[PDB]
Subunit: 316 residues, 4 copies
């Protein structure tokens, strides 16, 4: 499969245009918006969602440059979400750097999130497709719902596997799914090709999230400290002995224990909790690949298959 | 003390009631979610008071333009969701468990509402509706951040304070009335009349709100530069100007409460702010000239009078 | 803003929301009439703020007693209609074209809601329910008249002030909680416990309300002798006592607002009344002893704390 | 057949008990309630509804004294309605005497109304019948609705004959209908007999009100016009008069002006036969009440029920 260097090289001409657009579309008459927008936009995100979007639009031989605007739209939505999450979580650090709410305060972060969300809709309007906006209005409502679903799960050790997977789907997979779907919408593909791209995005997002959650136990236990129960921790809790179950249950309820997870890590190894989670990741990764079957052959399709392989490479 | 207050208000509310009930019912359907926590919190913030004004305006405006559909019900709901969301997001405090959960609830319920309003917009199946509301919602956001910037800035101009009023509060009124015209396929001139009515009505409401904060509210405490406080600073004497400046910058206005309120009285600061509100109220009424006569047009005129009732 | 008030309140509302939503929809069904004017006015009165506490109490109480039906929804609506009808009838002014129609609608919509509440009682198909509520509403009528008798009477005792609270306000809370017991077929000591909880909770709320009127002042202008004004008069100096006496006799206090408010502070009048509220609050909590432990019982304790949160 | 003196004489034993009940059952701990309730109960009402109640019960051979309590219940409800109406209408006189709201103020009148209403329910409880309370809670809701329907009609010259009749039924006849129906319920009659007593009370109530509205324009005179209340005589005269007469009646209704000189309005009524038309409706209603009593067993009590129906339209007929 195609490696990251080549994927990026393939995508760079498009990603340069998207970067320019992301930076310029922050503009406002209000200086605080320009500052905070600058800060969040230029803090060094991996820009994975717009990369997906542009590779997808090319894979479907797009004739316009509308995938640049669409890519900018997706990243604005994701950025709006990040700003709000960091206030909601009271995060202090992101991308090795102080968070926007730490630098500018909670109030300003929330409001500029709203500025970026609404700005992303002004941009959607320029694509002149009511369907684009139906999909994204739907997607963003789901994201908001997933955020509350995650809050309901905070410090809840009774959080079920289904509830956990629903948060992955609503809060992460749905936006990847929307991105790839909308590449098909822009290029006027059939329902079945739209479904293929939609599925690749969904399963890819799911894989990325599962692996992020795995990597958190290989700082370690950032999720635990924030009171966020994830599958490795839950599986270990469900299948361990009574003592292991109790300490994990305690850890989830309190958010204590990040500075020494030894007995929790041991429980994961013994129950196969990480292995189980790794298998769901690999599964999702393969499902993303299989979903691309119909897509015409091109270097861009190989790039999309590449990403699905990269998403789980630290686990495969 | 509801049926007492105004003869026009009694008729206004009664005329609007079938529409307002329909809106209330639509809101209860559209606020609903697949997530238990959202339904639990959402119920109380949507159904409570302080929800009446913008939907009332919206349905009265659509009836005045002789709407033939029920799309004004959806539009009324969209406007109140936008309003409720922006309110919740303006309740966010900077750096207890009360404030942490308040912040969380305010952001996430706000986000649910804001996003749901856009879903509802799409059901109207109109690109122009999306263009208008996407621009309006962006301007409201710019408005809210501009207000934040102006917090504790004693050099805030009059123009800048009015830009806040317009962009934060008035723009939404303006969009609501504009869109009544759009849904009913009115001419440009009619659209402009309605747009201007909404704009100026909203401006009046906001100014009057700022006046009533003194004739006591937290604008002084927060160190928010509103017109009455700014004017009194601009027309007070050497020391009066200096204490008000300090109050804005620091927030210690409650220490010097008595002398600050005296300055407002002596400079006629509240009087000046009252004049601007009455002007706005009149500009709203004036903007309706091209609208054909009806009970609904009379209601819209009534609301303009009611906005400044407490300061006329 | 609702979500910043209390962690207890957050949990209580979330816990009650499924019931409170059902009550809301039931109220809208049962407020409807064949007379368009009743619907036009009724809509706004029933969906206003200040509608939530008594239904909240009722559903929480019925859940705390493990109710197996949805009759608590009907009971909650009945209790809110009674409250609303009585409020409307307490808005009547003695003698103004706004005030003429205001009286008419207040009386007539009040009568509609009062009568509709009795029709709803009958659907519960319990003679004990009819007996309890006929007694409660009669006592509430008595309490409102005793309040009217005390208007402008400076020789009003502390006992007499309390008797109004028990009859006018607390009795409704008491009936609501008792009836939760009755509908769930509890024992006397349980009924007695719930009854007492309602009584003292309602007493606490009313005491705090009277304090909050002077930490805002409508009661002063009307010459309504509440405990904060009376205590100040009893323990003020000769002049302060005479000023407060006159203020009650003639409804004149707004002229002497500053000396009077100062007297309340100087005499500890507000603090004294705050203590009585805290006593009531605590008596209500103590009354729940025999109630099985549950999240709903915990919610009722939370309500008791919330009643005096602004005071405590 | 039977004259008013014989009717009152026959009913005297029951009405003594009822009068005592009505005076005693006002009792409360609150002095102002005792005062105001005393004033209204002892101001000299006709006691027509309790009279009707007790005659109806005797006619159905009631074995208990529950009809005293029922009759007192009905009068208390009627009394609560008067107190509220006089506040809504801002009336100053009643039974040649200052109204309670004039003596005590509006607020007290309204609240004491509520006291009487709730007290009447406390008395209903003692009859230990849920169906009774269903009937009276339904009846009293319809009364309340009727009061608002009347309010909507105030100063409205476009008030229809149907809307005017609907007010009569809901505001006046419905309580008569319920009184006599409940005399059937208390004595365990069949559905056919309940319906018969129900209809007698309804049509009787209708007749009384129609005559009241007619008598407002014959011999204070024109009391309804002043309150902006369009009644059938005035409305009919408007519909069938010429353009000038129509215009002045339309003006009279909208403004509530003209009570002190009705000359041209009365002339319009004479010419259009508007009083005559309204008299026919009253007679019709009276006859409808008598027909309705066809299945009730004979007695001096039934003959008093027929006698009241004849008495209702005496002045007119």
């Amino acid at each position: 499969s195609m490696d990251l260097d080549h994927i990026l090289s393939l995508a760079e001409p498009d990603m340069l245009a998207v970067n320019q657009l992301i930076q310029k579309q922050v503009n406002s008459d209000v200086s605080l918006i320009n500052q905070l927008g600058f800060y969040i936009v230029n803090s060094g995100g991996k820009r994975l969602r717009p990369l997906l979007t542009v590779l997808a639009a090319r894979a479907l031989n797009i004739q316009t440059e509308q995938h640049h605007t669409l890519a900018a739209i997706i990243e604005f939505i994701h950025t709006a979400t990040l700003l709000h999450d960091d206030v909601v979580d009271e995060s202090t650090m992101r991308r090795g750097r102080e968070t926007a709410n730490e630098v500018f305060g909670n109030q300003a972060s929330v409001l500029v999130g709203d500025f970026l969300y609404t700005r992303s809709f002004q941009m959607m309007v320029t694509l002149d497709s009511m369907r684009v906006m139906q999909i994204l209005s739907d997607a963003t409502n789901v994201i908001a719902e997933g955020e509350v679903l995650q809050l309901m799960n905070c410090n809840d050790p009774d959080t079920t596997e289904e509830s956990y997977m629903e948060v992955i789907y609503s809060k992460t997979a749905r936006l990847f799914e929307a991105a790839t779907l909308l590449a098909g919408v822009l290029t006027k593909q059939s329902e079945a090709i739209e479904n293929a791209m939609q599925d690749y995005g969904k399963y890819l997002g799911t894989a990325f999230q599962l692996v992020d959650d795995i990597m958190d136990y290989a700082n370690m236990g950032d999720d635990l400290a924030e009171g966020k129960p994830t599958l490795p921790l839950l599986y270990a809790m469900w299948h361990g002995n009574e003592q292991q179950t109790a300490i994990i249950r305690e850890a989830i309820e309190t958010g204590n224990g990040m500075d020494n997870l030894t007995p929790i890590l041991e429980t994961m190894e013994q129950t196969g909790a990480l292995t189980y989670t790794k298998q769901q990741a690999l599964k999702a990764s393969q499902q993303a690949i299989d979903a691309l079957s119909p897509i015409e052959e091109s270097v861009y399709k190989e790039a999309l298959i590449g990403l699905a392989h990269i998403s789980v490479e630290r686990v495969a």
